[model samples]
Target chain A: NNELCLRNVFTAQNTAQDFNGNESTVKSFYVTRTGKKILVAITSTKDNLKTVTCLTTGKTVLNLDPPMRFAQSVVYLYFIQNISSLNRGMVIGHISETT
Target chain B: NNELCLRNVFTAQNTAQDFNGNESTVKSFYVTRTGKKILVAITSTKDNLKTVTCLTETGKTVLNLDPPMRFSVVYLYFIQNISSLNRGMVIGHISET
Candidate 1:
């Protein structure tokens, strides 16, 4: 159903928005629609923290809307297999819509 | 050429660590590595604020270092995309480690 949004949105060619070269934690990938990469994060070796370089530096970590199961982990494994793969999660802009 | 990190990592099946079933911003992608997703933010309609729910309801930000582009924004279109996604359930506190 939401295959278009889920499948390989972060390709090797997505360098302009991809974050992977660094010796970081999470490989870093874009989850938004094309050209909607307002939020970009990177993994680290400190605690359970992911270094997201976007509107904010330290955001929060969210569980999936439906939560992550085993098979889902498997799929991510394939994508996560490399340094540049897209994995969707919750990320908000540190900025304000009201302000 | 920093090739490995420059690719399409997100797919539809990668649901566990995947965040796409909401009407939020950035399609909600995880940038960190596995088992270490300590930062998750949500986009809003405000001027320049994203609501992040994690170990702390409000995950304040401050980079220990400078970003590549210094996290530059072109316009509202790009800035507007910097929002959050709802509909997902919240859980747990973040570790200080």
Candidate 2:
């Protein structure tokens, strides 16, 4: 398991030496900060494009381009939440990073 | 401040609508768990190559790499300079089918 590689071996951390060509993906994605009412979700479908939603009043925020089902895409959300100050959020992807 | 876009409005969070060309860069880098001894660092230089170091509590580097190689953090974080793109990036977790 990848967990074992993280816990013990330093050699396993050598991406150039030990990379196995596996990319990261999240199924059933959700992000919410502690004590916050807002929540973010990127839901996949069997026959439609993926949906990106942010719920404070529950709204469909964005849809992926080129309409597809579950994404083999590399995406990450920059989630910034504030109660007394401000809140900022971004979904940065179609990303081409190594993992 | 962009804070104005968030507190009173929802439209500012839209990346497609309000995206900027600014690429993200962390000058003072640090990554460590609360109880963990391990830490990750990405130190930059003015005219030299950047260094990616993972040091444990012992203050010895467990992993270190130079620019001649593909830069990555156990495939979790990716670092590189894209000449054509005109920027270097610390990105990670890229999945493709």
Candidate 3:
């Protein structure tokens, strides 16, 4: 079968016509896959381009997304090491993302 | 003349009687000298110790405070390097004592 891949798209609000008669909308896309690659695309109506441009600009953002298990473990270790060295007994409360 | 030295003392609020029948207050002292050493002392009422304990518990917190000039330069470089590697656009708004 194929590998697990995740694709996400985000759109910006449509802008009203400006004093100079220019109107536009911006949209962005993110593509990522485990052990594969990460990509980004940006589109703008003002530019009137046929396709969105690569956010990385000729290069990929990441060659491969690290495995979930390894990423989680290593990130936790690194976070703890840095925070502990700087502030003793301090705890990270929370982190979140909203649509 | 001797090197520049700075000393400060801090007092803590007296603690009220507790369930264990203990009452105490804590006081701390800090001593720092340019091109010499930094020292700390802590005294407690409950402990009934003759003298305050060395907060550092060893040699010293910092030696000579790095001569002010060297300390500032090294600290600036270290902070900029670390921040740049992590985030490019975010600004650290404020830091104060």
Candidate 4:
């Protein structure tokens, strides 16, 4: 049983999908990027040296390695497409508020 | 902005969608039950006397009207049109968790 889990922020249908440059408490999430595009979304889960190519839509889960602890505790998801090219859904995580 | 709000349990995609009356940390979510059937989902944003429903295709919302308190939550959903007149199909909850 996990107390901390993914939480919703907004959806594609919300008319407001841009987080600008605000890093949120987004730990894990679903993303949509252009197909075969490189550098769609970057993260420290790879030490700023990690890179991967998206081969499918919604093929994403930015589960940060070791569960990073940024000051803002926010996530920045920019698909420049290793996965979802559309925003059917999105999520952030709560490191088990109970924990 | 509110603190206490809907979280997530298991989506319909998960093989373990049945909570079996076991309420966990589930808060807000989306559900797809049979058309025109009452009893697809139940929640209380207020208290034991509160009530609402899932009438849209992607019904979504949070249940904690009050924030910051000792509370546990869950989203109980099921199809309810006629007991013996249905067995077709529709769908269930969704998420990014």
Encode model 2's per-residue lDDT on B1-70: one tens digit a residue: 0111111100010000002332223232222223532222232222133334343566544233223212
Candidate 4 residue spans exceeding 4 A from truth: A1-52, A57-76, A79-89, A94-99, B1-50, B53-97
Q: Which of the two candidates, 3 or 4, achieves a greater lDDT against the reference?
A: 4
* Chain A only TM-scores, each candidate in turn: 0.25, 0.24, 0.23, 0.20
Docking class of 3: incorrect
lDDT of 2 by residue, A36-79 (tens): 43322232222233333333444434433332222265233222
TM-score of each prediction = 0.19, 0.22, 0.16, 0.20
Clashes of each: 51, 0, 2, 16
Decide which is better by lDDT, 2 or 4.
4
For each of the candidates, the C-alpha root-mean-square deviation to the true structure, in angstroms, is: 18.8, 20.5, 22.4, 16.4
| Candidate 1: tens digits of C-alpha lDDT, residues A1-99 | 111121122312111112242323343434444446432333322222212333324443321121121221221111222222113222111111101
A1-99: candidate 3 lDDT, tens digit per residue: 122122222323222222354443433322222444222322232322222222334622222111111121222101111222112101110010110
Indicate which candidate wins on TM-score. 2
- Cα deviation at A29, candidate 3, in Å, is 0.4
Estimate the TM-score for candidate 3: 0.16
Which of the CAPRI classes, incorrect, acceptable, medium or high, describes model 1? incorrect
What fraction of the correct interface contacts does each predicted structure contain?
0.01, 0.00, 0.00, 0.00
The stretch of ten residues in a row with the least summed lDDT in candidate 2 chain B is B9-18
